[PDB]
Design a binder for this molecule. Structure first.
Ligand SMILES: Nc1ncnc2c1ncn2[C@@H]1O[C@H](COP(=O)(O)OP(=O)(O)CP(=O)(O)O)[C@@H](O)[C@H]1O
Ligand SMILES: Nc1ncnc2c1ncn2[C@@H]1O[C@H](COP(=O)(O)OP(=O)(O)CP(=O)(O)O)[C@@H](O)[C@H]1O
Ligand SMILES: Nc1ncnc2c1ncn2[C@@H]1O[C@H](COP(=O)(O)OP(=O)(O)CP(=O)(O)O)[C@@H](O)[C@H]1O
Ligand SMILES: Nc1ncnc2c1ncn2[C@@H]1O[C@H](COP(=O)(O)OP(=O)(O)CP(=O)(O)O)[C@@H](O)[C@H]1O
Ligand SMILES: [Mg+2]
Ligand SMILES: [Mg+2]
Ligand SMILES: [Mg+2]
Ligand SMILES: [Mg+2]
Lengths: 317, 318, 317, 320
C-alpha cells in the first residue's frame, strides 16, 4: 500500500471546472487501458490532481487490479537506489506488471535523463499491453521544458484534460464541503470563502478553522492584516487619480500606480511577496515590479517615493 | 507477443507522404524476405513507423509466420539480463527462429557496443536465410552516429523509406481520422487541425479532446495562451517594420534579427516554454542559441533597447 | 545450409579492383584444394567479399563437393555450444569433413582462445589433406591483432588478395547493376552514383530507391541535404581564400586549418552527423580534428570563431 | 595418412641453417631407429619443421615401412576420444607398431598430464624396440614448462638440432623458390624479399603474390605503408638527436627512450597494429613493443605529458 483509502470517486466534488477530468478517470476505470489510455491530468496547485489519481487506483485495488501510485520524484529516487543496489530489473518488471499506472507530479521529470528513459520504457511497455496509465502534472505537456521530446508527444497523443477551478466550480466545492462538515450554508461564509480562496487546499484549510473557532474568528486574522494593505483605497488611489477596481486588474501610466503600491507594502509595511501578491497570483510579477521601481530610481523621482514613504509612516506607524 | 492487434494495415491511412513505405511493406509481406528484405523506415516524431511495423507483424502471425517486435532498447535490456542469467544462447536462437523481424526505434543502438554486435549476427543470420526484416528509426541510417560502420552500411543497401507528412498528405489523415468518430465534414475543424498539427499523435491528440470538450472549447484555450504569444501582432512587427507571416521565416537579416528577437521576449516576459515558443517557427534546438545569442551579444550597442521593450511587454502584457 | 543461392559467379561483377580475387577463386575452384589452398580475401566494408565466398560454395555443392560456409563469430558461438553440450567431437569432425571451408569475417577471431585454437586444427587438417580453404577479412592479416602469430603465418602463407574498387572498377558495377534492374543507362544517372557511393551496398540501394521514387525525385532530396553541407564553397573557402576541391585533401596550415573549421560548422551549426561530415572527405579524422579546434580553444581566436558561428546562424537558419 | 606427398627431401632447400637437421634426418632414414634415433628438431615458427617430418615420413612410406605422423594436440584429441569410446587399447597398439613415429609441434604436450603419460609409454616402447622417433618443436626442450621432467630428459637425451634461418640460408631458399616457379632472378626482387621476409612462409607468400601482381605492385603495398612508418626518420630522429639505424639496433638510455615514443605514435595516431610496429624494425616478439608504450603512460603519472601532446599535434598535422 501507498494509496490512502480516504480518497474516492464519490468523495471528490464535481463542477464544470473538473468535470471532464473526473469523467475521463471514471469513464475509463471501466475498460482499464482498453478505452482511452494515456491520460494526462494537469492543473494549478491544489487543483485536486492527487485526489483524482489516488481515487482511481483505490477503485482498482477494490476491483482487484494490480496497481501502483508514485510521485515522479520518488520513482526517480527508487530507480536510483535499485540502480545502486544492482536491482534495476525487479524494479522494471514491478512497474511493467500493473493493470493501472498512476504517476503523480510528472513535472519533476525535468533534468533527469536516465531517470526519464526508464519511465519511457515502462510507458511503451504498458501501452503496447493496453494497461492503464494515468499521469498528472502542474503544467500542460508543452510547458515541460527539460523533458525529452519523445515523452511530450507521448503525453499529447492521449487525453489532455485541464483542471481549471473557475467560479461556479468553487461555488459547488465550497457548498459541498460546508455540507460535508455539518456547518450551515450562509451567503456571508460562502461569499468570503469565494473571494478569499483559489485552490481546494485553501478552502478546506479554512473550512476546518470555521469548524474549530467559528467564522467571526476568520475575518480578523485573515482580513485585518490585509486591511492594513488597503493601501490602495488608501493613498495611491488619491495621488495620481486611480480607481481601486482598475488598479486590481492588469490593464495599461494608470498602471504605474500599481508598481508603487506593491513597493510601499514591502519596504514600509514589511509584507511578504505572497502577502503582496494577494492584492493583484503569479508571485514573480511583484518581485520585478518592485525592482523596476529602483531600476528607474535614476530623474525627478527619488524624492517622490520618499515623500510618500514618509506619508505611509505617519498614517500607519 | 508485444504486438497490439489495434494497429493494422487497413487501420493505417495512405497519402503521397507515406504511400511508399506502405506499398513497400505490403508487397514485401507476400514473399517475406524474398522480394526485398532489409527494409529500413525513418520519419520524424509520431510519423507512423510503429503503426506500420506493428501492422505488418500482425498480418504476419495472421498468416501463420513466426514474428517478433522489439524496440531497440528493450532488446538491449533483454540481451543484458540473458547475459547475467547466462542464457544468451536461447536469446540468440529465439531471434534467428523467425520469419519476420520488426526492430523499432533502431536509433537506440548508439553507444552500445556489445548490445549492437549481438544484433549484427542475428541480422546476418536472418538475412542469408532470406527471412523478412524491417527496421525503424527517427533518423536516416547515416545520421546514426554511435553505430558500427558495418550496421549502417547494412541498413543503407536494403530499402530506405522516409515518411514525409506535408500538406496534401496530412489532409487525408485529418479528413479520414474524423469518420473515426462523427466529425467527418466541417471545414472549420479541419482547417484548425491543419495549421496546428505536425505529427499524427497531435492529429489524434486534438480530435479526441475535440470530441469531448467540443471544438469551440479548444478555440478559446488553444487561442488564449497562444495569444500572449500574439506578441507578434503586438510589437516586434512595429519597431523594425517586419511583416508577420514573414516571421514564420523561410529564409534577409530583417525577419531574422526580428526572428531571433521575438523568441527572447516570449521566453523572459511571458515565461513560455521552448516548445510553446518553437511553435512560432511553424524544432526545439533553433530557439535555444537564438535565445542565447541575444545576450551572447549583450555586452554591443544593443542593450537598453531590450530593456525598453521589456518594459513595454511588462506593461502591454502584465 | 547457410549458402544462399542468389550469389553466383555470373551474379557477381568483374573489374580491375576485384578481378584478381575473382580469378584466384575461379581458377582454384576447379582443381580444388590442390592448386592453391590458403586463400585470404580482404577489403573494406561492402567489397563483395561475402558474395565471393557464398558464390564459390554454391558452385562446389552444385558439383557435389561437401561445402561449409560460416562467419568466424558463428564458428565461435557454435563451438561453445557444442562444448557446453559435451559434444565437441562431432563438431571438429564435421568441419574436417569438407572439401571446401569458407570462413567469412575472420576479424572476429581477435581475443578468443579455445574459441580460436580449435580452428587451428581444422585448418591444419584440411590443409594437409589438400582440401580447399578460403578465408575472408576486412583487414590485412598483419592487421589482425589478438590472433595467433601461428594463425597469421598460416594466413599470409597462402594467397592474399585485396579488393579495392577505385574509380574505373565501379563504373562497370554501376553499369551492370543499372542493366540488372532494367534501368536506362544515362550520364546523370551514372555520374551521380559515382561521386556519391563507395561500397557496393551503397550502389545497390540508391538504385533500389531510383527504381521506386523516380530519379530526380531523389537527386532533389539527396543533393539537397548535401546542399546544406555545401558549407565549404559557402564561407571558409572565401576567408583565408583557399579554394574548394583543395580542402578535400590531407596536406600546410591554410587548407589543413581551413578544413578543420569547415568540419566544425556542419557539427555545431548544421548539426550534421559525424558520418555526413566525412563525405566532405573513416570517422577518426573528424572527431579529434573538431576536438583539436577546441583543444586549441585555450583566447581571442574564440572571438573570431564566434563570428563565423554568427555568420552561419544568419545565412542558414 | 596425414602425409601430404608435396613434401620431398629433394623438395626441401638446404643451407647451413637448416643443414644439420636435414642431414641428421636423412642420415637416420637409411637406417631407422639405429643411427641417432630420438631426433628433437626445433626452431622459429615457419622454419620448415613440418616439411622435414612430412618429407621424412613420405620416404619411409615409400620404402614400405609403417609410418604415423601426428600433431601433438591431435594426439591428445585422439587419445581422449578413444579413451571415451573405450578403445585406448587399439589406439595404443596402433602407435606402438609404427616403424617410424613423427610427432609434430610438441609444444602442445604442456598441461596435459594423463593426456601425455600415454605418450611417454609409446615412447619407451618404440624406443626399446629400436624404432625411429622424430619430434618437432617451437622451443628447445629445456624451455618446456608444464612437461614431465621425465619426458624432457628423454628429449634432451637423443639428438637436439635447431633451425635458425640466417641470411645466406635464406638466400638459397629465395633463389630456388623463384626458380621453382616460372620467375626470373633479379636484384631488386630477390633483395626485396630479404629485408621484408623472415620465415619461409613469408618468402612464398610474396612469390605467390609476385607471380600474380608483378613487382611494381608490392613496391607500393608492401613499402609505401612502411614509408609512413619511416616516422623514425621524420620526427623521433629529428628531436632528441637519435639517428635512424640507432633505434633499430638493440642498445645509452637516449635510444631506449626514443623507441618507446616512436612506437607510441604509430599506435595512437596512425592506428598501426602491434604486428606492424614490430615488423618495422626490432623484432623479438610482441611483448617488447606493447608493454613498453604501456610503460609510457605508466611513466605518464607530469612534465612527460606536455611534450607528448605537442608531438601528437605534429603527427596529426603532417599525416592527417
Ligand atoms: N474536487 C475535489 N473534491 C473534493 N475534495 C478535493 C477536490 N480537490 C481537492 N480536494 C481535497 O483537497 C486536498 C488536496 O487536493 P490534492 O492534493 O488532490 O490536489 P493536488 O494534488 O493537485 C495539490 P499538488 O499541486 O500539491 O499536487 C485533498 O485532501 C482532497 O481531498
Ligand atoms: N497513416 C496513419 N493512419 C492511421 N493512424 C496512424 C497513421 N500514422 C500514425 N498513426 C497513429 O499515430 C499513433 C502513433 O504513431 P506511431 O507510434 O506509429 O508513430 P511513431 O512510431 O513515429 C511514434 P515515435 O516517434 O514515438 O516512435 C498511433 O496510435 C497510430 O494509430
Ligand atoms: N562485384 C560484384 N558483383 C555483383 N554484386 C556485388 C559485387 N560486389 C558486391 N556486390 C553486392 O553487394 C552486396 C553485399 O556484398 P558483400 O556482403 O559480399 O560485401 P562484404 O562482404 O564486404 C560486406 P561486410 O564487409 O559487412 O561483410 C551483395 O548483395 C552483392 O550482390
Ligand atoms: N627448408 C625448406 N625448403 C623448402 N621449403 C620449405 C623449407 N622450409 C619451409 N618450407 C616451406 O614453407 C612452408 C612452411 O614450412 P613448415 O610449415 O614446414 O614450417 P613449420 O613446421 O615451422 C610451420 P609452424 O612452425 O607454424 O608449425 C611449407 O609449405 C614448405 O613448403
Ligand atoms: Mg499531487
Ligand atoms: Mg515508436
Ligand atoms: Mg561479410
Ligand atoms: Mg609445424
Amino acid at each position: 500500500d501507498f494509496l490512502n483509502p480516504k480518497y474516492t470517486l464519490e468523495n471528490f466534488i464535481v463542477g464544470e471546472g473538473n468535470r471532464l477530468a473526473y469523467e475521463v478517470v471514471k469513464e475509463a476505470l471501466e475498460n482499464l487501458g482498453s478505452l482511452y489510455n494515456p491520460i494526462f491530468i494537469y492543473g494549478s496547485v491544489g487543483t485536486g490532481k492527487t485526489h483524482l489519481l489516488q481515487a482511481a487506483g483505490n477503485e482498482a485495488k477494490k476491483r482487484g487490479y494490480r496497481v501502483i501510485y508514485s510521485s515522479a520524484d520518488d520513482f526517480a529516487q527508487a530507480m536510483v537506489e535499485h540502480l545502486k543496489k544492482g536491482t534495476i530489473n525487479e524494479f522494471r518488471n514491478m512497474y511493467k506488471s500493473v493493470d493501472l499506472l498512476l504517476l503523480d507530479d510528472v513535472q519533476f521529470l525535468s533534468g533527469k535523463e536516465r531517470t526519464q528513459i526508464e519511465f519511457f520504457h515502462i510507458f511503451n511497455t504498458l501501452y503496447l499491453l493496453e494497461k492503464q496509465i494515468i499521469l498528472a502534472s502542474d503544467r500542460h505537456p508543452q510547458k515541460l521544458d527539460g523533458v525529452s521530446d519523445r515523452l511530450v508527444s507521448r503525453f499529447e497523443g492521449g487525453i489532455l484534460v485541464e483542471i481549471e477551478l473557475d467560479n461556479k466550480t468553487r461555488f459547488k466545492i465550497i457548498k459541498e464541503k460546508l455540507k460535508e462538515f455539518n456547518l450551515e450554508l450562509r451567503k456571508e461564509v460562502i461569499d468570503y470563502l469565494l473571494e478569499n480562496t483559489k485552490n481546494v487546499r485553501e478552502i478546506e484549510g479554512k473550512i476546518k478553522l470555521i469548524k474549530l473557532k467559528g467564522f467571526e474568528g476568520l475575518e480578523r486574522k485573515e482580513r485585518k492584516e490585509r486591511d492594513k494593505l488597503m493601501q490602495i483605497v488608501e493613498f495611491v488611489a488619491n495621488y495620481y487619480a486611480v480607481k481601486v477596481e482598475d488598479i486590481l486588474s492588469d490593464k495599461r501610466r494608470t498602471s504605474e500606480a500599481r508598481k508603487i503600491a506593491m513597493y510601499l507594502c514591502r519596504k514600509v509595511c514589511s509584507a511578504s511577496l505572497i502577502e503582496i501578491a494577494r492584492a493583484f497570483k503569479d508571485h514573480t510579477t511583484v518581485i520585478h515590479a518592485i525592482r523596476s521601481v529602483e531600476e528607474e530610481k535614476k530623474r525627478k523621482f527619488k524624492h517622490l517615493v520618499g515623500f510618500l514613504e514618509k506619508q505611509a509612516f505617519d498614517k500607519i506607524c
